[PDB]
Design a protein around this ligand. Structure first.
Ligand code: ANP
Ligand code: ANP
Ligand code: ATP
Ligand code: ADP
Ligand code: MG
Lengths: 1595, 50, 264
């Protein structure tokens, strides 16, 4: 408004309104001048409120600010109350002195915020490590100064290894620190909190005492280890006692100090004499220590001592290598470079200060050890590359330059920098640079590093974006310049307070601090820091030596050969195996595999030891370890860790590579007899095949065993096979088998994560009125944690059965990591108990982050784990024991009987289906008819992707219906039931019929014939013996013999009232076939889906077949791009209801004994997410497959009872459509409704035309000759014009119905006609429906000739000149009747009306030429028809949007045009459609709904219009009170029209009829040059629904 | 606006722009500009501009 | 004391519903009427010198009349409602059929009230606490059905046990099998169980004191009584399948898993 008034000041007509404008300008400015202040006074207050009431101790720290904030809050609350009593903007502005009061409040709140910031900065500077802590965290720390336990979680951010502080029972004295691993350092002098109450003071004392005690313990450790250094033999017990007595860090430091001092004394002693005995003594002592450690590590040790032993071995191997190198080089002076270049440790206990006692030297560099506790860190194998890294990095630090180890990913760069920093005892802080780069703390973190003294390593600094890179580069440049200022010699450091400009303050920089920048080439460092940073190429780490040292650390006798074998093997696997995201042959995987191999070796030592001990034997750990194959342990570990992840295509290649690298060594799988027996029992119980390996079903048994192994090892795992590989069945079988094996109850919580929103999944915090609402996953976790019903005793697995995406797994990363902790925005930290196992099922991990894949184990369920034979066996086993009619009441009784003795004849249905299985077994064999048919069908192309289980489920459902039909015949013939001969013939024919309709049911007619020919070639069952009829055209009667479908399709007569809208489908061959299949697949409650080209007739056939059934209650839902689970939930709330039962909450329809079936007219159309999944499709999938869903509001499982789904679609090739998920297409059987063809069209339109000609009784005899013509020419057009030539040359039976409607409207007012007039109307409708859409003139000439040819062929002896003259025109303006008129009279009338139109609505001349009068007549004709929608396509300009308006004005149609805004959501389009529909139907006001490509930029809203174009009513628009208001207005309109209606359904039908009659849609488009638009070529459904008119360009 | 699709209602001459229907003042003139000389405009805009 | 408190009384006709509630009202002659009967109990707190009323609504035995519950309780008054299921001990072979029939009818009514699921979960969690917060004057084998509202099963005419023992050959095993089934049903609804006779005046004061205790917070000191076959009293929160399993020690011809209608 302010900008618009300022612009109005420039208008030439502004002088008249000037004074008024100025007044508003003042008010407008005042309004801004108020609210610009107000939001500030709000924000700070809210912020201050969040600080001054969340912590109760802030009152004591800041009393004056607390009092000022109290006095401010009272005034602000009063002002807000006054505003609440009058929320109008103008009323608020006129409050007396609001501006000055708000300015005072802004000033005082700013002052208090400044005081709080200064206080927090003072607290940070008092204890510098708080600079690594955020504002809220620091406030929590200081506020909870007396509740020390709350501080325990923040130490991991401030200290390097301190995870907590050990405290006295009253929490008044700090006794020590503890690490994550539980290693504890007990202070020599405890820190007394009571004497130093302030948090900063006692935290500083804790840091000081940590350093002092670490130094004092290192002194004793070195003093003790000096004895081992000078001893010829080491007693293992004393060495282990020394290792236990001291921490890992001090242990490794003591070893390094002793070795360095011993080598220094040796080199001093040799002193130019050339006597190498002292270095030989040092090497001997190192080798003796290595032998002692190697013997000790094979034994069973506690985990912490095992880590200490591994660290000592890793250090002593490097020490041995260095001493051997020195002996080989004949170094004979301590100042030789070969000794100086090796890192050296000089401990001076006599130094009084405790931060300059240990000095670490390397070449020039002379660092001091900062005694920061690091816990039990992971040591690094000191390869020559890491030695080079240490040398260069220390050289750069000595020169005060920065470090830049650059190289490819996973080469140890950041880990090497961390190891170097830890070796010198300096706190390292790695900053990740992958979408987790918290900038707002980065300046604070830099200030903390500068003040406290600590290293910082940027992992992959290249990955920062350009703005982020430049800002961080500037900050690091300033820090590096401040550091380089130290190096100059002139600056005397007696008084040298170095400073750097950070966050607009002079921050003192300590010399110990340093910064490192890891980089990934492909590249260079930023130009700011190229001069200040030394770069090192860490291109290729030494795999062989790392493997050697690690394998030696685990106690392997042979490590050189094993390392030299395993290392090339991993690279061989990386190259040869097919590239997949989940494969990981990096060094982390290799080290994990080697640790697993060490664990397996130790397990074997313990197994052999206990096995011998149960017998009579003498035991020694070393002797047992000597005679074992290390290669067998290593290959076993490699296979156990890799094969579960291996795809079936890659497993034999992996075994070939393993045989090549490890010759003559084979991995025999560990035998699990008990679990295999339980698997056999459960598999027989659940009708599943079981095999002992290399049999039918061996691979699946192996995969479930691997799943058990991964569940045992990891606390999170995934199954990532393709759809239909048995992962969900395998997991269910495993849970039910461990139920028997371990006597522990298995509970499953299956969640579809993508169906539910993330907010409902993890629970959302209310932005106001703070209260927590547990999400579904959080609800389950809290339920198990509380254990009200003893859930801790039970074992529970959570299975996320849905596609994995980055968005919903962010919170789950903390749980899946080693932390095992769910953190929520509420601030609660849920600890996952050991009983929980978070599981995943995904068809693929295409959109899964590597962070998610790394944390979880995985078992790839390749599609060739479930053979066809296994599924056939499952089907035949289900048939023999599951009664097919008893349903779900007897499902529970299946578990009551372990064998069901005496229940073989449970019902006659069981006997009939058992006999049917006996007839069907020969055809289900491994090389039977079904298998060959399926293999051939996989070759055939299908519009939808052909999955094996979809076809197999369709076939099984059809056979189920076959046996049901036999049961029906037996019921209808109680005197003599079905004989086995008739049963044999019937099921043999039915199996072929079902094979065709299951496999080729998704293909065209020609390919159905092809599959029929192949079956006829390979089958033994007799087939129909009629040559020119496809097999699919035949049905199998209840008697075995075939019978054509044509016998079962009646010839009906339609009323003249409904000739073009008999929603009851005219019975045709395709319709009877499809309703038969519809009943067969609805008997099993499977979700049917039908695909086909637009206008094929799927919607009508589905509706008619569904409504024919008595029980079915149809709910018509139409899907769109914006449809979500909310639509289905709303529909359930409307028609269905939730009721509680002891089994659980059950959703059921309100009407008892009726099956509610949901029609989803366009299943394909919903938009995929960014990760290629449709939410509503996944929701429907979970409903149909799990038989229920989770009420999110209650977070509880509910089960559908009488709910079904049946969908329609266009093929996925069409532009607006998308393919469906393979986990979803498995359940649904898809039928392809192609176009009816000549015979079906002739029959349907014969019925329609016989109905239409009833008006005039002299032309009944000409019904059948006309009907062929309407078909023949139409088919000819369908053969001559295709979508390839132009995108809109689409034909369907909708054109034929439009033809029938046009002739019907022409003939309805006419009392009588001659045959020639009927031919003329037929030709006119032909031209108006087909000749208009054409683009090229010669095509129009061809249509002109062909109309005459068809007419004279089917109407002989009728003279062409009278019947059809070329200038054919029909118009209603000249005369009240729709009769032919001359060109000149119409020209004169239109010219007069156009001259009128010039001075009525728009004053622009409009010339009438020969090619625009025709368009006027066409537009008028489409306006007169019912459901008449026009699509004018043509060059820009040319009259469209000007002729449409003109004809609309002439015919009195009020023009409505949509006005799309930005943020014009689908609800706004819905409201506009509601308004126009109310005007058109209730008020009976004709409307021309004009739409243009400019405002039709979004295709999302153009699929809501398709329902209107096809049916005239869009269900779901008026839901709610709008339905009541529309019903009231509709009945008022009906009373106005003179019809008295009561029922809402009849009133809605009349409203729909009125909308058909009145509302018209005029689309205007340009030719197909809009590729850039989302429409591209708009959907062929839109072309089919409207009547297309090619405007062209002026001749 | 380039096509001058004025809708006349009494003295109010509206033109649709987004949600709003704004009054075309007589003095209004617009000049479109392009610094890029390598552009392929749609045929919709070509008929609406010189 | 709070006003507007309600008691819903359910059970077969001839069970005792009107006679029990009339006697608790201190009245000799309550007028019986087909459909939905109404009366009120006068409640006085002697420690405070204050007095209130409790509404009592009694449903007819015919399921045709279940529509009338809309005149007794609403989505607003359900938190202030106590439920009484009346079991006829002179017809024990109809007790489990009656209790399942009436609990289902009440649930079918609660589902129709469309109570906000958050308020229903508040009442459900509060009732789980009001049941676990029991102790004689978490762990679970209870509340499968979890009505989530106060529930009391009142067995009426328990003096008729003295006729079942003489005319139908009933024994301690039949009475304990009836008591175990009643207690397992009470666990499913988190309910209390009380045995009463208006003819022998058994447990009438105990029933009044328990009703006023759960409805108005009055002090209560009576422990569970499980030794007297015709005077049993079990407060909501006292029982569990282990306390029920002691009754199975008296089983010599029936099992803990056999159906109620096969034996009774
Ligand atoms: N057997 C039939 N009898 C009568 N009309 C038929 C028949 N088969 C097809 N039609 C006509 O075919 C046209 C298409 O009908 P409809 O069922 O709406 O197609 P559709 O495939 O559902 N359109 P869509 O849902 O967008 O894919 C209508 O004009 C029908 O009248
Ligand atoms: N037959 C005609 N004689 C004279 N002027 C005409 C004629 N047809 C159209 N015009 C003028 O041509 C201009 C543009 O016509 P119009 O058909 O509205 O463009 P358009 O087809 O709507 N372009 P677009 O909406 O983007 O597809 C207007 O100024 C019309 O007055
Ligand atoms: N061991 C088995 N023996 C025989 N048939 C089996 C076996 N395991 C699974 N099947 C069959 O395979 C079908 C698919 O297996 P499952 O139900 O585990 O689905 P899935 O592979 O996870 O597939 P989706 O992607 O559809 O969820 C099962 O319904 C059953 O018909
Ligand atoms: N010389 C080495 N000795 C031991 N382990 C190493 C060595 N080099 C690399 N690794 C391992 O390889 C992994 C490489 O990851 P990291 O160094 O964190 O990032 P990047 O190597 O991609 O910069 C580390 O986890 C580390 O354990
Ligand atoms: Mg699955």
């Amino acid at each position: 408004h302010i900008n618009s008034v300022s612009a109005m000041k420039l208008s030439p007509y502004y002088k008249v309104f000037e004074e008024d404008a100025l007044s508003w300008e003042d008010k407008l400015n005042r309004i801004m001048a108020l609210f610009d202040v107000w939001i500030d006074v709000q924000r700070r207050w809210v912020y201050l409120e969040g600080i001054f009431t969340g912590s109760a101790d802030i009152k004591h720290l800041l009393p004056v600010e607390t009092q000022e904030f109290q006095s401010i809050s009272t005034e602000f609350l009063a002002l807000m109350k006054k505003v609440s009593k009058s929320p109008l903007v103008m009323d608020v502005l006129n409050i007396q002195g609001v501006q000055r009061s708000l300015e005072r409040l802004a000033d005082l709140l700013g002052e208090i915020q400044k005081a709080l910031g200064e206080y927090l900065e003072r607290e940070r500077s008092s204890f510098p490590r708080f600079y690594f802590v955020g504002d809220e965290d620091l406030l929590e720390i200081i506020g909870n100064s007396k509740n020390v336990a709350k501080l325990q979680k923040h130490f991991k951010k401030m200290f390097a290894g301190v995870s907590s502080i050990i405290l006295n029972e009253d929490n008044s004295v700090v006794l020590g620190i503890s690490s994550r691993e539980g290693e504890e350092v007990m202070f020599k002098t405890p820190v007394s909190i009571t004497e130093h109450p302030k948090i900063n003071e006692w935290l500083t004392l804790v840091e000081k005492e940590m350093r002092v005690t670490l130094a004092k313990l290192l002194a004793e450790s070195v003093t003790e280890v000096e004895i081992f250094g000078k001893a010829t033999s080491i007693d293992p017990n004393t060495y282990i006692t020394w290792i236990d007595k001291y921490q890992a860090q001090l242990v490794v430091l003591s070893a390094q100090i002793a070795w360095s001092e011993n080598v220094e004394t040796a080199l001093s002693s040799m002193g130019g004499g050339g006597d190498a005995a002292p270095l030989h003594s040092v090497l001997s002592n190192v080798e003796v220590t290595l032998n002692v450690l190697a013997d000790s590590v094979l034994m069973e040790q506690p985990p912490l001592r095992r880590r200490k032993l591994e660290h000592l071995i890793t250090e002593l191997v490097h020490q041995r290598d260095v001493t051997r190198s020195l002996i080989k080089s004949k170094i004979d002076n301590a100042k030789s470079f070969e000794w100086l270049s090796q890192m050296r440790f000089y401990f001076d206990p006599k130094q009084t200060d405790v931060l300059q006692q240990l000095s670490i030297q390397m070449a020039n560099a002379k660092f001091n050890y900062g005694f920061e506790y690091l816990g039990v860190q992971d040591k690094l194998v000191q390869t020559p590359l890491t030695d080079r890294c240490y040398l260069t990095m220390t050289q750069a630090l000595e020169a005060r330059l920065g470090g830049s180890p650059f190289g490819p990913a996973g080469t140890g760069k950041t880990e090497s920098v961390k190891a170097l920093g830890h070796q010198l005892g300096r706190f390292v802080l790695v900053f990740n640079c992958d979408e987790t780069f918290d900038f707002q703390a980065m300046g604070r973190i830099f200030v903390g590093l500068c003040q406290v003294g600590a290293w910082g390593c940027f992992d992959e600094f290249n990955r920062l974006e350009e703005r982020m890179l430049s800002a961080v580069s500037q900050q690091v440049q300033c820090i590096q310049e401040a550091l380089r200022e130290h190096s100059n010699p002139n600056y005397d450091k007696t008084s040298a307070p170095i400073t750097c400009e950070l966050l607009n303050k002079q921050v003192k920089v300590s010399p110990d601090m340093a910064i490192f920048i890891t980089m990934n080439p492909g590249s260079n460092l930023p130009d700011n820091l190229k001069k200040l940073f030394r770069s090192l190429a860490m291109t290729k780490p030494d795999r062989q030596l790392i493997a050697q040292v690690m394998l030696y650390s685990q106690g392997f006798r042979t490590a050189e050969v094993l390392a030299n074998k395993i290392v090339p093997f991993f690279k061989l696997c990386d190259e040869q195996l097919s590239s997949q995201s989940h494969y990981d042959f990096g060094l982390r995987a290799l080290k994990s595999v080697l640790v697993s191999a060490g664990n397996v070796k130790r397990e074997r030592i313990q197994k052999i030891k206990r096995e011998k001990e149960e017998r009579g034997e003498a035991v020694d750990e070393g002797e047992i370890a000597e005679n074992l194959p290390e290669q067998e342990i290593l290959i076993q570990s490699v296979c156990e860790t890799m094969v579960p992840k291996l795809v079936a295509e890659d497993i034999p290649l992996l075994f070939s590579l393993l045989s090549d690298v490890f010759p003559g060594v084979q991995y025999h799988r560990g035998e699990m007899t008990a679990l295999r027996e339980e698997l056999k029992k459960v598999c027989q119980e659940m009708y599943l095949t079981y095999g002992d390996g290399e049999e039918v079903g061996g691979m699946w048994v192996e995969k479930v065993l691997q799943l058990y192994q991964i569940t045992q090892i990891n606390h999170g795992l995934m199954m990532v096979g393709p759809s239909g590989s048995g992962k969900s069945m395998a997991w269910r079988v495993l849970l039910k088998a461990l139920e028997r094996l371990e006597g522990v109850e298995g509970v499953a919580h299956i969640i579809d994560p993508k169906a539910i929103s993330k907010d409902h999944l993890y629970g959302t915090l209310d932005p106001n009125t703070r209260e927590w609402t547990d999400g579904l996953f959080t609800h389950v976790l809290r339920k198990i944690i509380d254990s009200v019903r003893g859930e801790l005793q039970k074992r529970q697995w959570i299975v996320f059965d849905g596609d994995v995406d980055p968005e919903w797994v962010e919170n789950l990363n903390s749980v899946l990591d080693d932390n095992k902790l769910l953190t929520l925005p509420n601030g609660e930290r849920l600890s996952l108990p050991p009983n929980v196992r978070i599981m995943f099922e995904v068809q693929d991990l295409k959109y899964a982050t590597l962070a998610t894949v790394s944390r979880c184990g995985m078992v790839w369920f390749s599609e060739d784990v479930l053979s066809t034979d296994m599924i056939f066996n499952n089907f035949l086993a289900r048939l023999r024991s599951i009664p097919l009619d008893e349903g779900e009441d007897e499902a529970q009784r299946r578990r009551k009987g372990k064998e069901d003795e005496g229940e073989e004849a449970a019902s006659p249905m069981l006997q009939i289906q058992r006999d049917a299985a006996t007839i069907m077994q020969p055809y289900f064999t491994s090389n039977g008819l079904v298998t060959k048919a399926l293999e051939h069908a996989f070759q055939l192309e299908h519009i939808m992707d052909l999955t094996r289980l979809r076809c197999l489920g369709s076939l099984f459902s059809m056979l189920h219906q076959a046996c049901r039909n036999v049961a029906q015949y037996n019921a209808n013939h109680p005197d003599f039931p079905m004989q086995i001969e008739q049963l044999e013939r019937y099921i043999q024919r039915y199996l072929v019929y079902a094979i065709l309709w299951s496999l080729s049911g998704d293909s065209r007619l020609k390919m159905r014939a092809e599959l029929g020919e192949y079956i006829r070639r390979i089958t033994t069952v007799p087939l129909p013996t009629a040559p020119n009829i496809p097999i699919i055209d035949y049905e199998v009667s209840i008697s075995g013999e075939w019978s054509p479908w044509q016998a079962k399709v009646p010839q009906i007569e339609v009323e003249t009232h409904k000739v073009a809208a008999p929603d009851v489908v005219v019975p045709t061959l395709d319709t009877v076939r499809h309703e038969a299949l519809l009943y067969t697949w609805l008997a099993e409650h499977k979700p049917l889906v039908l695909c086909g080209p637009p206008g094929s007739g799927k919607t009508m056939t589905l509706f008619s077949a569904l409504r024919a059934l008595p029980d079915m209650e149809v709910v018509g839902l139409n899907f769109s791009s914006a449809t979500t689970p909310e639509l289905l939930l709303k529909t359930f709330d409307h028609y269905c209801e939730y009721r509680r039962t002891p089994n659980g909450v059950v959703l059921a329809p309100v009407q008892l004994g009726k099956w509610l079936v949901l029609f989803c007219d366009e299943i394909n159309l919903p938009d995929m997410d960014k990760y290629g999944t449709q939410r509503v499709i996944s929701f429907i999938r979970q409903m149909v497959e799990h038989g229920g869903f989770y009420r999110t509001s209650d977070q509880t499982w509910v089960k559908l009872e009488r709910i079904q789904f049946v969908g329609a679609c266009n093929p996925p090739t069409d532009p607006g459509r998308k393919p469906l998920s393979h986990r979803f297409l498995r359940h649904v059987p898809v039928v392809y409704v192609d176009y009816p063809g000549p015979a079906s069209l002739t029959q349907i339109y014969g019925t329609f035309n016989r109905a239409m000609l009833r008006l005039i009784p002299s032309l009944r005899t000409y019904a059948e000759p006309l009907t062929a013509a309407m078909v023949e020419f139409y088919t000819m057009s369908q053969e001559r014009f295709t979508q390839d030539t132009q995108p809109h040359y689409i034909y369907s039976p909708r054109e034929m119905t439009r033809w029938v409607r046009g002739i019907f409207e022409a003939l309805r007012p006419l009392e009588t006609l001659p045959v020639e007039g009927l031919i003329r109307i037929w030709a006119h409708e032909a031209l108006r429906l087909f000749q208009d859409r054409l683009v090229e003139d010669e095509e129009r000439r061809w249509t002109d000739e062909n109309i005459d040819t068809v007419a004279l062929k089917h109407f002989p002896n009728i003279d062409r000149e009278k019947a059809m003259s070329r200038p054919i025109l029909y118009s209603n303006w000249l005369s009240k009747d729709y009769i032919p008129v001359d060109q000149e009279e119409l020209r004169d009338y239109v010219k007069a009306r156009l001259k009128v139109f010039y001075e009525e609505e728009l004053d622009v001349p409009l010339v009438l030429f020969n090619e625009v009068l025709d368009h006027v007549l066409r537009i008028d004709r489409i306006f007169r028809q019912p459901q008449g929608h026009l699509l004018l396509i043509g060059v820009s300009g040319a009259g469209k949007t000007t002729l449409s308006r003109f004809v609309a004005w002439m015919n009195g149609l009020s023009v409505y045009q949509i006005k799309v805004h930005r943020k014009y959501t689908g609800e706004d389009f819905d409201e506009d459609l509601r308004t126009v529909l109310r005007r058109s139907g209730c008020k009976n006001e004709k409307i021309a709904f004009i739409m243009d490509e400019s405002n039709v930029l979004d295709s999302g809203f153009l699929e809501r219009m398709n329902t209107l174009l096809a049916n005239g009513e869009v269900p779901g628009l008026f839901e709610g009170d709008e339905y009541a208001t529309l019903m009231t207005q509709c009945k008022e309109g009906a009373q106005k029209e003179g019809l008295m209606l009561d029922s809402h359904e009849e009133l809605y039908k009349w409203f729909t009829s009125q909308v058909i009659r009145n509302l018209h849609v005029v689309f205007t488009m340009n030719p197909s040059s809009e590729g850039l638009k989302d429409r591209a070529a708009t959907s062929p459904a839109l072309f089919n629904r409207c009547v297309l008119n090619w405007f062209g360009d002026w001749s | 606006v380039l096509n001058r699709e004025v809708r006349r209602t009494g003295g109010r001459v509206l033109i649709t722009l987004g949600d709003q229907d704004i009054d075309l003042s007589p003095s209004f003139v617009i000049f479109l500009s392009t610094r890029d000389p390598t552009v392929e405009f749609p045929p919709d805009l070509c008929s609406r501009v010189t | 004391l709070p006003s507007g408190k309600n008691i819903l009384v359910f059970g077969e006709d001839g069970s005792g519903k009107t006679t029990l509630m009339t006697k608790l009202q201190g009245a000799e002659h309550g007028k019986k009427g087909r459909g939905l009967e109404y009366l009120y109990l006068s409640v006085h707190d002697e420690d405070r010198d204050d007095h209130t009323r409790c509404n009592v609504w009694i449903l007819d035995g015919d399921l045709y009349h279940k529509g009338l519950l809309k005149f007794a309780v609403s989505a607003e008054s359900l938190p202030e409602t106590l439920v009484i299921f009346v079991a006829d001990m002179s017809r024990p072979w109809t007790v489990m059929e009656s209790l399942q029939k009436w609990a289902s009818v009440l649930r079918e009514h609660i589902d129709k009230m469309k109570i906000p699921p958050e308020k229903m979960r508040e009442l459900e969690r509060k009732f789980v606490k009001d049941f676990q917060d029991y102790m004689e004057p978490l762990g679970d084998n209870v509340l499968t059905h979890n009505l989530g509202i106060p529930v009391l099963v009142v067995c009426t005419k328990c003096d008729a046990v003295s006729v079942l023992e003489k005319e139908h050959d009933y024994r301690d095993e039949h009475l304990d099998f009836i008591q175990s089934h009643l207690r397992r049903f009470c666990l499913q609804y988190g309910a209390a169980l009380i045995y009463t006779s208006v003819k022998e005046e058994k447990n009438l004061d105990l029933l009044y004191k328990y009703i006023v205790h759960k409805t108005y917070g009055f002090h209560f000191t009576t422990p569970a009584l499980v030794v007297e076959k015709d005077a049993v009293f079990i407060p909501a929160g006292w029982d569990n399948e282990k306390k029920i399993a002691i009754l199975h020690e008296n089983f010599t011809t029936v099992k803990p898993e056999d159906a109620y209608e096969d034996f009774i």
